[PDB]
Design a protein around this ligand. Structure first.
Ligand SMILES: *C(=O)c1ccc(NC(=N)N)cc1
Ligand SMILES: [Mg+2]
Ligand code: NA
Ligand code: NA
Ligand code: NA
Ligand code: NA
Ligand code: NA
Ligand code: NA
Length: 486
């Protein structure tokens, strides 16, 4: 159990612009905490001469991150009156009231105070912290000091901050920093990682460690690089979907590729991983429609690689969320009664869908933003497939562009970058609730525009396998991977 008390100075010396900026910091904090699957109870207080309580921890809705964010969003600087005074002592007493009683020893308390430290009313605020420590039995007995149950963070607001007062109120813990200037984004970023336990979220799909010290492996933890030694060697990308499986494209391999010639690499490890076997989608067949004028048919272009050794999740090796699983429901912060159709309506709505994929560019991994044409622009994106090499004589183009495909690329609504051969097998991702959900697998394209090319044609479209359209296979092959498919 955890309680987070947001206390915002709304006095005269803060000013409108910086008061709003302060809320932004808090809004972003709530969002990031929620993204980690953590559900604390929130206290929301603004103050000047007196405190104004917007949210109390005892309220049932205090643990609803959307509701709290809504409250914070509605708070207007001018709402808080009597700005000529600044009584920080009182602000902390309001927090004291939320803790006092008319399993307590199991609740952790985190106070986040945003002020310039210039109180000109009431006594010394330090006194209240002392009362709070006493109330929570902290620093009273060795072997049970319970220092872990309280954290007092003070974020200095504005250009004219009184460093001494701010330092005085903040917790004092070894190897930790509890004081930050609001504009010092490095410090604020470090605070988060001192507050939330990374361990409690290792089993969560679509998670990324976003710290500034992070590497490409940290930013794309699910990313797997696949090598096939043959003839000309093959290179494909893939995504970790479970401790044993990596999802990629079927065309990356042939029935003539032997297990030992296929190596997988993850997490920035120097070593390669050995595979047990490749599971091609049963309906995949690149020569299945030659008669219809389709030299290579990419329908059902997906495959699951079962590794020999089970992976262990860490900040450089994590699974990406898959459609219609309980993991994606939680990642989206939706009730347990959510259905596959509902996740679909949320992830793949009938419109241009903001999405992204990853592309290696000379050792480094980069994110490419694209738009999935799933609205009244879809038919046009698909028809451009008629301009693909070897597809000039396909009778009905909808015979090559099956319902299994998602379509991206083009100049509308935006100039979409294109996938390169090396990106094939990689995941087409949707970024929601600060989490990453895989909606497709990079398969093929119409125009060869890879270095990425200068300017590309308006018909340079790319196709990807819609995971929603191969769910029965994913659910069947991954039934024992504890992913909780719906
Ligand atoms: C994957 O192997 C892949 C993806 C996209 C393309 N683009 C084009 N053929 N234009 C090729 C290969
Ligand atoms: Mg003031
Ligand atoms: Na709400
Ligand atoms: Na002690
Ligand atoms: Na950890
Ligand atoms: Na480390
Ligand atoms: Na659930
Ligand atoms: Na769909």
């Amino acid at each position: 159990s955890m309680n987070i008390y947001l206390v915002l100075d709304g006095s005269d010396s803060i000013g409108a612009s910086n008061f709003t900026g302060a809320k932004k910091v808090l809004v972003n904090l709530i969002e990031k905490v929620a993204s980690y699957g953590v559900k604390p109870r929130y206290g929301l207080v603004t103050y000047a001469t007196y405190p104004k309580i917007w949210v109390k921890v005892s309220e049932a809705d205090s643990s609803n991150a959307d509701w709290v964010t809504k409250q914070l969003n509605e708070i207007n600087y001018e709402d808080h009156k009597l700005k000529s005074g600044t009584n920080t002592k009182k602000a902390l007493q309001a927090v004291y009231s939320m803790m006092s009683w008319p399993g307590w020893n199991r609740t952790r308390h985190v106070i986040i105070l945003m002020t310039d430290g210039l109180h000109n009313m009431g006594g010394d605020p330090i006194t209240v912290i002392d009362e709070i420590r006493d109330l929570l039995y902290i620093g009273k007995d060795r072997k049970n000091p319970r220092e872990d149950y309280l954290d007092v963070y003070v974020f200095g607001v504005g250009p004219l901050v009184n460093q001494v007062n701010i330092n005085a109120l903040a917790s004092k813990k070894d190897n930790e920093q509890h004081v930050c200037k609001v504009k010092d984004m490095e410090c604020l970023e470090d605070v988060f990682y001192q507050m939330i336990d990374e361990s409690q979220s290792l089993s969560l799909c679509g998670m990324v460690w976003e710290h500034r010290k992070g590497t490409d492996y940290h930013k794309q933890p699910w990313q797997a690089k696949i090598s096939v030694i043959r003839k000309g060697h093959e290179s494909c990308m893939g995504a970790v979907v479970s401790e044993y499986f990596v999802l990629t494209a079927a065309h990356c391999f042939t029935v003539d590729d032997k297990e030992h010639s296929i190596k997988v690499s993850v997490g920035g490890e120097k070593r390669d991983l050995e595979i047990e076997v490749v599971l091609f989608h049963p309906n995949y067949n690149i020569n299945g429609k030659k008669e219809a004028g389709i030299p290579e048919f990419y329908d059902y272009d997906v495959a699951l690689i079962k590794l020999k050794n089970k992976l262990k999740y860490g900040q450089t090796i994590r699974p990406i969320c898959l459609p219609c699983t309980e993991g994606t429901t939680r990642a989206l912060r939706l009730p347990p009664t959510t259905t596959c159709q509902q996740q679909k309506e949320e992830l793949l709505p009938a419109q241009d869908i903001k999405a992204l994929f990853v592309s290696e560019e000379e050792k480094k991994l980069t994110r490419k933003e694209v738009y999935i044409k799933n609205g009244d622009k879809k038919g046009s994106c698909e028809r451009d497939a008629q301009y693909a090499p070897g597809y000039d004589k396909v009778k009905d183009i909808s015979e090559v562009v099956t319902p299994r495909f998602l379509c991206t690329g083009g100049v509308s609504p935006y100039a979409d970058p294109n996938t390169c051969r090396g990106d094939s097998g990689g995941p087409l991702i949707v970024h929601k609730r600060s989490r990453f959900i895989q909606v497709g697998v990079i398969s093929w394209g119409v125009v060869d525009v890879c270095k990425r090319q200068k300017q590309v044609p308006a018909h340079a479209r790319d196709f990807h396998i819609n995971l929603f359209q191969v769910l029965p296979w994913l659910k069947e092959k991954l039934q024992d991977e504890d992913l909780g498919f719906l």
